[model samples]
Target chain A: VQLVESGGGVVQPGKSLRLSCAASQFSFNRYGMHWVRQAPGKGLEWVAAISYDGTDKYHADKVWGRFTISRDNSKNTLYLQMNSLRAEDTALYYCAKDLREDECEEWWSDYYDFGKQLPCRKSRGVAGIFDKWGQGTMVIVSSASTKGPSVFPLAPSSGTAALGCLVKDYFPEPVTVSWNSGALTSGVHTFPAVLQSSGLYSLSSVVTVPSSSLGTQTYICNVNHKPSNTKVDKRVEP
Target chain B: VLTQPPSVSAAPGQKVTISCSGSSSNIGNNFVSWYQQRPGTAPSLLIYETNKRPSGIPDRFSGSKSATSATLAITGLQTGDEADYYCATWAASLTSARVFGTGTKVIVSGQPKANPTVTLFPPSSEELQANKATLVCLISDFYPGAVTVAWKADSSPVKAGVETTTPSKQSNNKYAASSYLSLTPEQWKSHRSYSCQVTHEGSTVEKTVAP
Candidate 1:
């Protein structure tokens, strides 16, 4: 069994890392894989789990994009990659299996066992349910200032207004932003950012929303962490 | 994707054969399983990964594997042998999804071959009748494999007398099987609805009959 973590410590925010867990003893067909996270004083938050059949996928809240889980049943190894690391992203990460009789029903509340309650906030999205869980990985994002472009200016057109969002820190990578509005014409605009140090980067995206539908529309900015599809989305009124 | 022929007919107490073919990859390593479905019932998982028992599955039903091909065999055939058979395999790429083969119908020969009649028994029904009346459900002429029958009132499990007769084979090579459930007529009337459900092939079919 080989669990390899990409070498590099003390990474600044906005960086990326690829973590993998490989097992040679058993066939990947017999087991399921999951990724989890735990902050300094927080509980373990489930990221996602991939089943043996490969069709079974479960995401917890807004953990998508920033965290990703994949496995090669033939290779007997699982991969988890996290991109755009941020200050709030510091936590212990773990990859485990969903050992249930009925793969579908096993991850329900009835199958979970917790040791201590961690201080974690529940995300509001499709992944609110914490059924089958993964062990967490601890990541420390150093709070420091790095040289990079400041926040971009707003570009508003007839039906679309672009909010230039950028993060200037240690790690730099491409970032993705999405918008949600009751109005039908809301969309997102993306751009690349540069890195100032190791595990840090500068990235930006323009959120487009209808001018007439300002208050009624909600724009969300999302960043995808490499390897692990852990995602964070914030609703802004622009 | 793979499937079996639409119809498989035989006599009571005889062996019946059903085949499933995959689009590719017939290696014995690929797991192949089988399921049985009855009218107004759900599909039940009978075999998994080519012949391994899934927790509580009975030994009477068995599966055999040949590279890229698999077979489900039943030792003793019986009456009440009218239903469907299906095969399934796990997806090679996706670990969470299972691919199911099209179903095969199992038919048993009855007496008086001149006019062979197919009677569809209402496996479950409800009636508002006098107290002490009896209600019976007949699940007959089913193909060998796995079959489950349950009677429920208002979505709640109820107790009723149950009996399953042994299947006898006929010279033509088909089997017959049946399950009987008896309940008090008054208790049946009190419940607004009654449902009889059957499971096969990872899917479920339910039938509700009113008084």
Candidate 2:
């Protein structure tokens, strides 16, 4: 397993930092890459992990929304990109494998702990084991105007049974809406509102439910904001 | 957080069982999910509506519903046993609000399961005139149940027109699959680094080809 730091050295606050970790000798699906940050003498903060399948992600309470993780399985590389960095983003960042097997548990845990940093562990194949791990790269992010949530308009009218919801207001681009009930339902309608000059856009959806079926039915509104997705739910009690 | 057996496998006509753990609320009184996929294919939600089988699902498969835990049991597994299984839970915060467990692959003994392989049909080349050429990414020997193709320009995610041919199961429970993406040769040359990503059995694999 090899974690390589991409991009050059120190980055000032508010800039972007990209770090990559590549695993050789092992298929990218067999392990996961975890990003952690540490101040000079503080505990490690878990940013997230890019799993082999590329879907598994876990973020610490404080690190959510500030970091992004992606991977290229063909290249066996995992990437972490941070934008609009702040002073708090300044810290040493390290990447390591989330060993999925049993034998590597201790080694994996040790690497995640405050104990002496260990080398990359080796696996079976052309590459023997992972011994060398990526050192923490320190990046200082400058503070900037804080961004707020974007909201879009709700769908005009779905089927009598469906309810349409949309992002009423939001910055950035691209948004998605979803519907949820006790059972998953489809056929909801969605349309994009024109984009605004302020780097924001509008979207609306129509969620319809059969009139007879409206009794405390729950509908969830999902917004796919960049770097994160947030959701809220409402019940239609008739 | 959740846990399951490291691995589980069974042959045709046998029973296959999978267990899923969930956080207090997600499982105890929440939803239990199950998905199935053949090697190198997309995933299908087999059991949703809690324990209710989706429409057109086979009766040989059944799921146990409970508040905090759930089990997906497939009875009389057919030659199709040579696939993968997965479980998931809903999370309000995620785009899908769903978290999937690692996959469990079913392989037949004696007959080596055919592993899916992805190949860039024309193999990107540097000499291709910029902005004038088309690039294609392909996946062969993949099951078709649940697979998709995506293109990434430079480092940002971009959507590319994708086309898939009819899927045919090959010998040894293997499958043949293919996907195509077209782009300007110039875009292909400069930021032509393209990736083909597939989601199967709650897992994903991506391949990047550079011009």
Candidate 3:
């Protein structure tokens, strides 16, 4: 099965836009459709969804009242309409096919107080899992190219006793990394920044440190990304 | 409570029946729903309202109900039909709650099977600095989607921090899954060897990643 998306491009803020995803080689009315999006350097967010029979429609709290998902059963097309878009709405939007919509109880536990108020224990079947997806269409609000990187600290190895920092998903590269102790530069190894398919950059750096300083000294990693005007200092300690 | 057999097996192009026996308060008075959960994936609805197929389900899968029991039958069973089946119903008693039958495993024999290709990856550098280590095992390109994974360190079974995902269906109609083993940096460095063992249809494939 194939899904093709259209109607995505640069637009000014506060403008309304409509994106269409056309599915092929599958019965449209037999499966539910979901709309998912990935911002410039962030994780995926579920925006909206419509059930097979059009009786149930769901929207994430963040996208509620701002985005609408509608489908045409005859043409096998699904549309996502956004109103009053902002810079944060700039992302790569994708439409996916839901496997099933039936709900089943997994497990339930009752944790109630002896007072008049008692809560109900409820459960639902597993959902939000997609099997087929579209290639993704880019929706960029004007002046939305710059994005700050997210940094993560990795566990030090017992063999090399190294301290590491991961920098990922920053736009308009030229990011710089430094350590709090200048002497650490002698044992530092910085990997090349690789460009991701989402038009961002990611890299990592590691520095060999003495085993004696493993949990004793505070190791700080400094990251500077000029385009995004961001600076981060992450410390590793006991 | 509902009772289901542990497992049932049949050859390709054969018929297999799974029975869910219960009392009149549950199966006899209410509707039953059956689910088919393949390896590494979520359960999909096969039959709802006792005997009706969902929108896209084929007729090969069926459901039937009697006075005190419900049965899910599959005709012309294919290798792809091998999965875990479960039956659910709402009880009618005063303390009413949705009930599920014990799971049943379906096996289709006498068909060509493919072995999974296993790949192992060591923990990243950051994990070492944080005194944490996690090993990953990637298993792909297998048939029937029935497999089990075990993690061993220095030729011994690892009990803590081990997780294996549900099998996911690949575009080629094969199956893939992943397993992870978490350990402390000291424990990982002390161990000389680590391996992930995968078993499919009575055969085991083990992939080792050395420190």
Best by lDDT: 3
TM-score of chain A of each: 0.42, 0.44, 0.52
Model 3's TM-score against the true structure: 0.36
Segments in model 1 whose C-alpha atoms lie over 4 Å from true places: A1-238, B23-29, B55-57, B94-98, B112-211
Query: What is each candidate's DockQ, to 2 decimals?
Result: 0.01, 0.03, 0.05
Candidate 3 residue lDDT tens string, A132-231: 6676788977543689987766556543576667675677779999888454665665545543433456666666688887767778988899888899
Off by over 4 Å in 3: A1-238, B1-12, B17-32, B36-71, B78-85, B92-111, B119-126, B150-176, B184-195, B206-211
Top candidate by TM-score: 3
Per residue, candidate 3 scores C-alpha lDDT tens digits across B1-211 of: 6788655767888788999987788777877777776754434568877887867888988899999999999999887898888786632321333245667789787757788876565676655776667675667778776777888887888888665655667767778776667578888888889989998766889878775
- TM-score (C-alpha, index-matched) for candidate 1: 0.29
At residue A164, what lDDT does model 1 achieve? 31
Off by over 4 Å in 2: A1-63, A67-238, B91-98, B110-211
- For model 1, residues A1-238, the per-residue Cα lDDT tens digits are 2233332345677788766655544455656666655443222344667766555566544555676777777767677666777766666665554433222322334423564322213211121111222223356665653333222222232324444333323233344344342232334423333322233444444444557666665555444544234355444434
Error of 3 at B69 (Å): 9.7
Q: Could you tell me the lDDT of residue B188 within candidate 2?
A: 60
- Tell me model 1's lDDT, rounded to 2 decimals: 0.48
